[PDB]
Design an enzyme around this catalytic site. Structure first.
Site, PDB file in Angstrom:
ATOM      1  CD  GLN A 172       3.917   7.392   1.150  1.00 35.73           C
ATOM      2  OE1 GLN A 172       3.347   6.965   2.162  1.00 35.73           O
ATOM      3  NE2 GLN A 172       3.809   8.660   0.745  1.00 35.73           N
ATOM      4  CG  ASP A 178      -2.319   9.602   0.562  1.00 34.12           C
ATOM      5  OD1 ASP A 178      -1.213   9.399   0.047  1.00 34.12           O
ATOM      6  OD2 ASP A 178      -3.160   8.706   0.698  1.00 34.12           O
ATOM      7  CG  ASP A 218      -1.897   1.158   1.273  1.00 33.16           C
ATOM      8  OD1 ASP A 218      -2.890   1.270   0.495  1.00 33.16           O
ATOM      9  OD2 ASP A 218      -1.691   1.955   2.207  1.00 33.16           O
ATOM     10  CG  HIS A 219       0.115   5.067   1.610  1.00 27.18           C
ATOM     11  ND1 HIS A 219      -1.176   4.638   1.644  1.00 27.18           N
ATOM     12  CD2 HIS A 219       0.083   6.370   1.118  1.00 27.18           C
ATOM     13  CE1 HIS A 219      -1.990   5.611   1.139  1.00 27.18           C
ATOM     14  NE2 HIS A 219      -1.218   6.670   0.820  1.00 27.18           N
ATOM     15  N   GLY A 220       3.329   1.537   2.158  1.00 26.60           N
ATOM     16  CA  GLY A 220       4.601   1.052   2.665  1.00 26.60           C
ATOM     17  C   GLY A 220       5.795   1.387   1.779  1.00 26.60           C
TER      18      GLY A 220
END
Lengths: 171, 171
Positions: free
Chosen positions: A108, B76, A104-106
């Site tokens: 980043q 976001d 997911d956002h990991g």
């Protein structure tokens, strides 16, 4: 026994923590939460309460056989660290080709390693452009395995994510 | 006359909406909230309720004299639009050098214009690396003015942000 470092701040996507943790532990691997302060509590977007095991200042990345980075807004928080310590931590894994799992956002946090040039990754749509700006080859798939780096986009991907991350550690 | 489009999703930083809105309106400018669906309600990360004026599907950027992007996690969410319509909306402002105001995480939407190369801005620490990777010259200042683009980092910068955004429109 193999042991996974999970880097976590507040407002992680609860299931992107609990589901991979349970898949890893079900395969016989241990997991350790690394966050700002040992014995502090971080709280998921949906209220799950997790106790931090090891402070980022004390954590030795060589202790761990893999790194897990749950999504939600936890990664964004981690990238607020004034010393950039979580990017530096992740960089041990990217630099040494240690299994690195990010959903997911990991991904980043992986931007902050400067190690993405020419790597192939997916993530949540929201951040794909920043991955591409970091030099990654970004695709839109439920799971992507580029040697050691396993990435997925959203909680619906967890089945695929979980199966790959456990395979990675079996090697 | 002069009308400022405010692009907004849930979990915006309340004051980063309300304080610039109020400065702009004090100085005689109108504001219009652009969001997923006309007449729906979005809710700030501290509870403030805002009605959406114009749906992103209907909205025409030419109609507006500036763009304002409040931070928190609103940017976001906007970047999660399947069709990327908030990036596309922003492209009008960056291509045509229209006043463009972004605070905290708000510059994340400007990444999606692909117009940041060589521009100078600031933002919250958490997103600076992504702005640099997008080709911007990133600095750490309370307010940065690069021709039409005004950026700031955190709510404490709002007096400096507000002064500059109102100065843009008067000019």
């Amino acid at each position: 026994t193999k042991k996974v470092a999970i880097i976590l701040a507040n407002e992680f996507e609860d299931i992107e923590y609990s589901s991979p943790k349970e898949a890893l532990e079900n395969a016989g691997f241990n997991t350790v939460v690394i966050g700002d302060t040992a014995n502090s509590e971080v709280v998921g977007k949906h209220g799950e309460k997790v106790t931090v095991d090891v402070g980022i200042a004390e954590a030795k990345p060589e202790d761990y056989d893999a790194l897990l980075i749950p999504g939600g807004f936890s990664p964004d928080h981690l990238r607020g660290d004034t010393e950039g310590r979580y990017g530096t931590f992740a960089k041990y894994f990217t630099k040494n080709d240690v299994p690195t799992f990010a959903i997911d956002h990991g991904p980043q946090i992986l931007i902050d390693t400067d190690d993405l040039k020419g790597r192939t990754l997916t993530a949540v749509l929201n951040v794909r452009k920043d991955l591409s700006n970091a030099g990654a080859h970004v695709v839109d798939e439920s799971v992507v395995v580029d040697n050691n780096i396993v990435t997925s986009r959203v909680p619906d991907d967890l089945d695929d994510f979980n199966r790959e991350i456990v395979k990675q550690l079996q090697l």
